[PDB]
Design a protein around this ligand. Structure first.
Ligand SMILES: Nc1ncnc2c1ncn2[C@@H]1O[C@H](COP(=O)(O)OP(=O)(O)OP(=O)(O)O)[C@@H](O)[C@H]1O
Ligand SMILES: Nc1ncnc2c1ncn2[C@@H]1O[C@H](COP(=O)(O)OP(=O)(O)OP(=O)(O)O)[C@@H](O)[C@H]1O
Ligand SMILES: Nc1ncnc2c1ncn2[C@@H]1O[C@H](COP(=O)(O)OP(=O)(O)OP(=O)(O)O)[C@@H](O)[C@H]1O
Lengths: 115, 107, 109
């Protein structure tokens, strides 16, 4: 009913601008983003199959946090799947978890109305 | 009972120093902060402006949550744009790396 | 512990030992994580004494890889006895979507 959710996308830095535009059409008014790092770990054979090394790899990643209540989660995740999908790795992932409370500081209101 | 919560504050990068006082005074022993960014989306054609923000994350169990939120509420307010918001969610477990403790004791 | 569940393991710690950490997490089966350079703040009631540190932050979302295996691997590698060893926070993730393949839940990770 008055449920609030956070949608967190971690993805490569591109079409952020296309996303901002489509997420706007569907009801999103504000979001947060940060520049951070991604790291790929793969198991690899050391030469001669003697052992295993962990191939480490580092990337630049965008992280986007969007808390919502009235805009349904299926609609954020589905429009983001859409502008960000390319078929190549670095397309990223979306994490959804739930928010007990939201507080609007400039206006003191709480719960689903503070968004 | 021994519930633990994360409180996430996203606000303009200002007044940080007093927010420290007022929180340490109610029992907050340590917090984490980072510089992020925030933007409004509007309208369809969409126009959006982007401002630097502070992301403050405090994890508590003993210090009542309700006492963190409104200590943040009272002190960060200015009525002007960029007071930001506060997101709270529940934490399943905390582990102290140095002590090995788990649960609210770890904090 | 239980199938279907996904958890975000969140570690805030010293910048040190990050590389032995990647090594070992990589071996209990973690294939990717996110980290960022943040800061830690220390508070003390004396009026209050306030310190500022550089800390590292590691986010790992897991399901098929048990969370007790991740936390213990982290306690081990990161622990030095002294303060700034940092903490681990764990919380449940309702769902994960793999953008490139369209999959959801554990098979997405
Ligand atoms: N399980 C995860 N936990 C935390 N962060 C992740 C996770 N998966 C991806 N990320 C973040 O998303 C970025 C993009 O990852 P992507 O979804 O492209 O994964 P991948 O490396 O292509 O394939 P895999 O599914 O094997 O991880 C990563 O660089 C990382 O910062
Ligand atoms: N739904 C949200 N999801 C993620 N971050 C948000 C959300 N709402 C606000 N924020 C963060 O809080 C910062 C403060 O923004 P502000 O409170 O001015 O949001 P706004 O909705 O644009 O303003 P108002 O609510 O006054 O119309 C934002 O720049 C953004 O970083
Ligand atoms: N309750 C908390 N909420 C949010 N971040 C924290 C919390 N405790 C620690 N951190 C982050 O992890 C870093 C490591 O701190 P550490 O775990 O070493 O605790 P400490 O400050 O040495 O002593 P204490 O046990 O009083 O926290 C901190 O500087 C901070 O960035």
């Amino acid at each position: 009913s008055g449920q609030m959710f956070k949608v967190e996308i971690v993805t490569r830095p591109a079409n952020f601008e296309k996303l901002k535009q489509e997420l706007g059409k569907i009801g999103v008014t504000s979001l947060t983003f940060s520049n951070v790092h991604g790291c790929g770990l793969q198991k690899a054979h050391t030469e001669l199959y003697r052992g295993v090394k962990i191939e480490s790899n580092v990337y630049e990643r965008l992280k986007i946090e969007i808390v919502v209540s009235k805009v349904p989660v299926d609609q954020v995740t589905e429009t983001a799947k859409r502008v960000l999908k390319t078929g190549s790795p670095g397309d990223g992932k979306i994490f959804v978890y739930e928010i007990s409370n939201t507080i609007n500081i400039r206006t003191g209101e709480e719960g689903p109305e503070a968004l």
